[PDB]
Amino acid sequence: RSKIDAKYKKKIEGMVRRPDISEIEEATTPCPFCKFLLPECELLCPGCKNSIPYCIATGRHMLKDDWTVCPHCDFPALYSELKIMLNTESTCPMCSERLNAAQLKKISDCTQYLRTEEEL
């Protein structure tokens, strides 16, 4: 409380003196390890206790039906989302190499990135 900027302190105090519980529910989507539904930005699955791979473009948990990888670094992204952010900036968010939206490929088999790592 003592370290907060005085610009925001009165607003932060005001939000605690008058709680507003209204909040847009995060959509729940299937864990790629066990199909347990959890919020798009929740990455430790409570259904299987695995840390899920994350989209390098948006940080949501990866989905088996929208998978791609950066060609320079092999890290996973949501194909729709990485294509969208490459219209905003000319570089990978992960490796900082230059990219073009035409270099992206959608992946039909992500299972090599999803084997529970005790098997490796």
Side-chain angles (χ1 to χ4, degrees):
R1 185 169 180 211
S2 58
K3 297 162 184 168
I4 301 172
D5 186 334
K7 181 180 176 176
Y8 310 125
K9 188 184 179 183
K10 283 189 174 182
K11 292 187 181 182
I12 288 164
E13 284 188 4
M15 287 185 287
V16 176
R17 287 178 184 119
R18 297 178 189 85
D20 183 341
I21 304 183
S22 68
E23 171 153 87
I24 299 161
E25 282 304 334
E26 183 159 32
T28 62
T29 42
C31 179
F33 290 78
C34 62
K35 304 180 184 175
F36 183 97
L37 299 179
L38 75 179
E40 273 183 291
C41 299
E42 188 156 53
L43 304 190
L44 174 55
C45 186
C48 66
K49 301 184 179 180
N50 291 300
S51 175
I52 310 163
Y54 65 90
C55 174
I56 61 159
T58 63
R60 293 178 180 178
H61 55 241
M62 282 305 302
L63 299 176
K64 287 193 168 179
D65 300 341
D66 193 22
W67 205 290
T68 191
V69 300
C70 172
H72 299 300
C73 73
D74 199 46
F75 266 76
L78 293 165
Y79 176 71
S80 64
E81 305 298 338
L82 186 63
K83 192 182 181 182
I84 289 164
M85 72 150 287
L86 289 182
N87 299 332
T88 75
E89 295 197 317
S90 61
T91 53
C92 182
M94 199 70 185
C95 71
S96 307
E97 298 295 345
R98 292 183 180 181
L99 283 179
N100 186 294
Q103 297 295 343
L104 304 186
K105 295 164 188 177
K106 195 180 178 182
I107 285 167
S108 56
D109 182 5
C110 50
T111 59
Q112 296 188 2
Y113 320 134
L114 291 170
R115 283 168 185 165
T116 48
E117 297 85 350
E118 277 54 58
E119 301 193 342
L120 309 178

